[PDB]
Amino acid sequence: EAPDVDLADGNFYASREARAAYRWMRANQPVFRDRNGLAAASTYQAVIDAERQPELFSNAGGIRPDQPALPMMIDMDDPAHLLRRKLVNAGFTRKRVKDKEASIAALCDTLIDAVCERGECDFVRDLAAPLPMAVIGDMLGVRPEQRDMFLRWSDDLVTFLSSHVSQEDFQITMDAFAAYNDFTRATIAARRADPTDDLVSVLVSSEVDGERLSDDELVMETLLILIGGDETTRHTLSGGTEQLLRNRDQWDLLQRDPSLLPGAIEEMLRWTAPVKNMCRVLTADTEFHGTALCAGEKMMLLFESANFDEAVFCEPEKFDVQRNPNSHLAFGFGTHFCLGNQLARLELSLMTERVLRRLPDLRLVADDSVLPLRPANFVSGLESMPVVFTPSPPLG
Numbered sequence: 340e341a342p343d344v345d346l347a348d349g350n351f352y353a354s355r356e357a358r359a360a361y362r363w364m365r366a367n368q369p370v371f372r373d374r375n376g377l378a379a380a381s382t383y384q385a386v387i388d389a390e391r392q393p394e395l396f397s398n399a400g401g402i403r404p405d406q407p408a409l410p411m412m413i414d415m416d417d418p419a420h421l422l423r424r425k426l427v428n429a430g431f432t433r434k435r436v437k438d439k440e441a442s443i444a445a446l447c448d449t450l451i452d453a454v455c456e457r458g459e460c461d462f463v464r465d466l467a468a469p470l471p472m473a474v475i476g477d478m479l480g481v482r483p484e485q486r487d488m489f490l491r492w493s494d495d496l497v498t499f500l501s502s503h504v505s506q507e508d509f510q511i512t513m514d515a516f517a518a519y520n521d522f523t524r525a526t527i528a529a530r531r532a533d534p535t536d537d538l539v540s541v542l543v544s545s546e547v548d549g550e551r552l553s554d555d556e557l558v559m560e561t562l563l564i565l566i567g568g569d570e571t572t573r574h575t576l577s578g579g580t581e582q583l584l585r586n587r588d589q590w591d592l593l594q595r596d597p598s599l600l601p602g603a604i605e606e607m608l609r610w611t612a613p614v615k616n617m618c619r620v621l622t623a624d625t626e627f628h629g630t631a632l633c634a635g636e637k638m639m640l641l642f643e644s645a646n647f648d649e650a651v652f653c654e655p656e657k658f659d660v661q662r663n664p665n666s667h668l669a670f671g672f673g674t675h676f677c678l679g680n681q682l683a684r685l686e687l688s689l690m691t692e693r694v695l696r697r698l699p700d701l702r703l704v705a706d707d708s709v710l711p712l713r714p715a716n717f718v719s720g721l722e723s724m725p726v727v728f729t730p731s732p733p734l735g
């Protein structure tokens with residue numbers, strides 16, 4: 340019998356029985372309808388087939404199941420989406436991202452410096468959560484002592500996207516946006532007058548097809564980057580490292596062979612799939628992999644379910660840093676494929692190599708049945724991950 344689940348309920352994704360539910364979907368009704376009738380593509384095949392038909396499976400209704408669209412790239416269809424993405428792509432060329440390596444590595448070593456003498460830290464609070472915010476913060480011109488304010492704004496906004504909030508939480512979300520809007524428009528004014536080499540400067544100078552980004556668009560697109568690149572990367576760092584620590588053979592492989600790190604990062608992404616789903620609105624009635632869908636309803640793409648689809652990944656519940664091929668969908672697929680995928684991968688690589696060498700005997704304090712996942716229906720991962728290691732002196 341079908342699992343009795345609510346795919347819009349954050350508690351489903353905090354359950355370590357979600358993958359058992361996915362497995363039933365993939366085997367019995369690939370395009371699944373949950374207890375409330377919400378449609379979701381659970382197989383790798385169905386997700387890809389939906390991704391490849393944007394004119395039928397549109398982003399222009401918004402990518403959350405019961406929230407309207409926002410005027411940002413991820414809530415647009417081509418050709419408007421393509422122009423917006425080309426404009427923002429100025430901040431994410433392969434050259435610009437690769438050149439961040441030294442600065443990201445410095446942040447990684449500073450963060451490890453803050454705990455390496457203690458012999459214990461919360462891997463989430465002290466390493467996985469701060470790094471993505473410090474990288475994005477530095478791109479946006481945020482003073483280091485103000486990162487924590489932005490981290491909380493991002494948390495508030497992620498949480499709004501991850502649930503159906505109350506009025507008090509709707510108001511908190513509006514307040515956080517208002518504060519982010521004020522900050523960003525101040526930056527935009529400052530950089531239109533005296534350009535630097537930061538993200539707002541590059542986005543202001545970007546030109547495509549004779550077009551440029553308006554102030555309104557700069558705020559919206561930088562907000563998408565703030566939210567989209569923060570707590571997502573966090574959860575792959577924490578959850579991916581968790582799997583290295585639970586399977587010591589995997590930890591040991593990476594420690595003795597640095598050339599295995601790219602493959603490890605890909606398996607961390609496949610396993611953690613921080614973005615649990617993105618929605619598509621149907622533009623017409625359609626029979627899709629055996630399920631009738633109605634014009635105007637939203638269908639979820641279950642990226643974690645796809646990442647554990649036995650039709651594509653042999654023994655998907657085995658964490659294997661050497662997995663080849665590893666064509667996971669953590670970043671999605673098609674025209675909306677994650678714009679920050681190179682930056683996310685760079686953050687994950689630089690922090691993980693440093694964790695491996697500087698905390699070489701790292702181990703989890705307690706096991707996973709007690710480690711909670713954050714209840715959220717959009718982006719989710721570990722709340723906390725206490726770890727211990729032999730102390731060492733900082734690098735400075």
Ligand code: HEM
Nearest residue numbers: 412413567568571572614617670671672675677678679683
């Ligand atoms: C592990 C970290 C991340 C994950 C798992 C992730 C996941 C995703 C997914 C699933 C999508 C939509 C793909 C689809 O629907 O097919 C997306 C889009 C996007 N992501 Fe990420 N992301 C991550 C990090 C980042 C970072 C670091 C940035 C920016 C610095 C970023 C910026 C964006 C943008 C701008 C889009 C919209 C692309 C478009 O609509 O064309 N993401 N991401």
Ligand SMILES: NCc1nc(-c2ccccc2)no1
Nearest residue numbers: 413563566567568571614677
């Ligand atoms: N990188 C994937 C990602 N996208 C978002 C997002 C943030 C605000 C509005 C819509 C989408 N959060 O993570």
Ligand SMILES: [Br-]
Nearest residue numbers: 369382384385
């Ligand atoms: Br299928």
Ligand SMILES: [Cl-]
Nearest residue numbers: 401402403409
């Ligand atoms: Cl949205």
Ligand SMILES: [Cl-]
Nearest residue numbers: 399415416419
């Ligand atoms: Cl559009």
Ligand SMILES: [Cl-]
Nearest residue numbers: 478536537538
């Ligand atoms: Cl930048």
Ligand SMILES: [Cl-]
Nearest residue numbers: 713721722723
């Ligand atoms: Cl949390």
